[PDB]
Amino acid sequence: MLVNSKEIVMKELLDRYMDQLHMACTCQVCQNDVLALSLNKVSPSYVTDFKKIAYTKAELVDKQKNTAMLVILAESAAVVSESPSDLCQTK
Amino acid sequence: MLVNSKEIVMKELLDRYMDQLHMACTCQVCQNDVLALSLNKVSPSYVTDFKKIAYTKAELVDKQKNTAMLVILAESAAVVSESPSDLCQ
Ligand SMILES: [Zn+2]
Ligand SMILES: [Zn+2]
Structure with missing residues (x-):
């Protein structure tokens, strides 16, 4: 299957x-x-x-690399928090 | 709900x-x-x-942009051909 391994990383960090x-x-x-x-x-x-993908996901341990990614997520989280899509929950 | 639209373009151009x-x-x-x-x-x-993603498949039917992507396809095609994965045959 064809898959961007960064999506696996993000989904994991996000959860x-x-x-x-x-x-x-x-x-x-x-x-x-x-x-x-x-x-x-x-x-x-x-x-x-x-x-x-297993090798990639493993390279981004709790120590070292993951922080740069957590920062982008946090940053994106801010944007969605303030400007949510119309498909989100309403009333 | 979560797709890279480029993925939809490359598949359509490849086939x-x-x-x-x-x-x-x-x-x-x-x-x-x-x-x-x-x-x-x-x-x-x-x-x-x-x-x-539905209309993305239509505005890729337009050219010039896909030309730049066709090149990419071709350049990717040469590498894969020259060095096939051992999951093929
Ligand atoms: Zn929501
Ligand atoms: Zn093959």
Whole structure:
């Protein structure tokens, strides 16, 4: 299967560090918006071997690399918090 | 709900030019390699609404832009052909 390994990384960081990103709404819509803003800000890393995504995801341990990504998510989270899409929860 | 629109463009362009790229193997595995190498050389364009990906397939039918992307396809095609993944055959 054809998949950008950065999307796997983000989705993982987003789920693990959801609370420290301080989102106004946590519905799937708002979450997808954060992901999209963030994935459009990192260089694509498409692969075809699931074993290869495992290697990438492992390289971004709790120590070292993940912080730069958490910062982009947080930043994107701010934007979605203030300017939510019309497809989000309403009333 | 979460797709890179470039992915929708490259797939549509590949299955319109695949038989012109002089690819060594044309199995799904090598096709994925081509798409992956190509997707990695263009800027991501992630979307969340379904209304964009539908019309995105129409404004890619327009040219000049896809020409730049065709080149990419072809350049990706040469690499995959020259060095096929061991998941192919
Ligand atoms: Zn929401
Ligand atoms: Zn092949």
